[PDB]
């Protein structure tokens, strides 16, 4: 009781939810568009000053503690990878931070990075569209192909949000909350936190065997980011060859994901359907 009632590490957990999961909703949307214009639009994505300023400004409107515990120290690739390289940190009480480990901070940062990459691909698909792809017969075929790709990508993005939340965040987050609710002793809390981190990483396909489907999905996401960038640059950077390459990437990703998750089968059925 003496160690727990004062330090309010539940506030640290809430900040992890709000930043490592981008739960500051309206401000989160504003920061998502700003981050798209920063990293995706070739702004100061790796600049510590610019990234920190953007993060603090978007995270200071109503709940500044998100900007306090999370500052966007940017630094330094695939379309998903070029946006990476930043650094960050957090604040927590001590000697509560004595039991607290930087490994859990790194795991939360990895979850935040996965969410940020998903949101960056989502914003790239948001800016891109059939209209963007043809912005800069063959015209009808390009419009139809872009429409099919956009419909597939939109369904995939909505499913990613909801289902990934359920698998890695909703179910795993609820389990972590329940475990922390049970955890009140230093050793028990450390064990509960480690178990919660492992459960959250379980839906992250961190296992070596689970990394094959993760790599297929990552290749699909990188190809999607490149294709969305080419569509945003229109037909000038969009070629019938490039469109065929994107369609082949989508189809091969679907087939390989179906095979991998069948060899887990729910993702296999989804990929075969896609």
């Amino acid at each position: 009781r003496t160690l727990k009632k004062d330090y309010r590490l539940v506030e640290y957990l809430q900040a992890m939810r709000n930043f490592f999961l981008m739960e500051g909703g309206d401000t989160m949307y504003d920061f998502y568009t700003s981050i798209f214009d920063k990293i995706r639009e070739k702004e100061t994505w790796q600049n510590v000053s610019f990234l920190n300023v953007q993060l603090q400004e978007a995270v200071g409107q109503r709940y500044p503690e998100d900007s306090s515990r999370l500052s966007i120290s940017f630094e330094n690739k695939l379309p998903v990878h070029t946006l990476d390289g930043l650094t960050l940190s957090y604040k927590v009480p001590w000697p509560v931070d004595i039991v607290i480990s930087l490994e859990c901070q790194k795991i939360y940062n990895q979850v935040f990075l996965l969410l940020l990459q998903i949101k960056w691909a989502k914003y790239s698909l948001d800016v891109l569209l059939f209209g963007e792809l043809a912005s800069s017969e063959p015209v009808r075929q390009q419009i139809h192909r872009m429409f099919l790709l956009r419909v597939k990508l939109m369904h995939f993005v909505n499913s990613l949000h909801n289902y990934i939340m359920t698998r890695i965040l909703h179910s795993t987050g609820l389990e972590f909350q329940h475990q922390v609710e049970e955890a009140k002793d230093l050793d028990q809390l450390i064990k509960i936190h480690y178990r919660y981190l492992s459960t959250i990483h379980d839906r992250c396909l961190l296992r070596e065997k689970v990394s094959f489907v993760k790599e297929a999905i990552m290749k699909v996401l990188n190809l999607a980011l490149m294709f969305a960038d080419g569509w945003q640059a229109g037909l000038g950077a969009w070629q019938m060859e490039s469109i065929e390459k994107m369609e082949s990437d989508f189809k091969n990703c679907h087939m390989f994901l179906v095979t991998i998750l069948n060899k887990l089968e729910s993702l296999a059925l989804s990929l075969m359907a896609g």
Binding site: G25, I143, M154
Partner: peptide, 24 residues
């Protein structure tokens, strides 16, 4: 979408643009 602390389509620009690819 953003009525609750927005985790679903607070930045719904992409969702709006994904309804119909052909802006025409």
């Amino acid at each position: 979408t953003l009525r609750y602390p927005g985790y679903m389509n607070n930045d719904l620009i992409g969702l709006i643009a994904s309804l119909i690819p052909t802006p025409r």
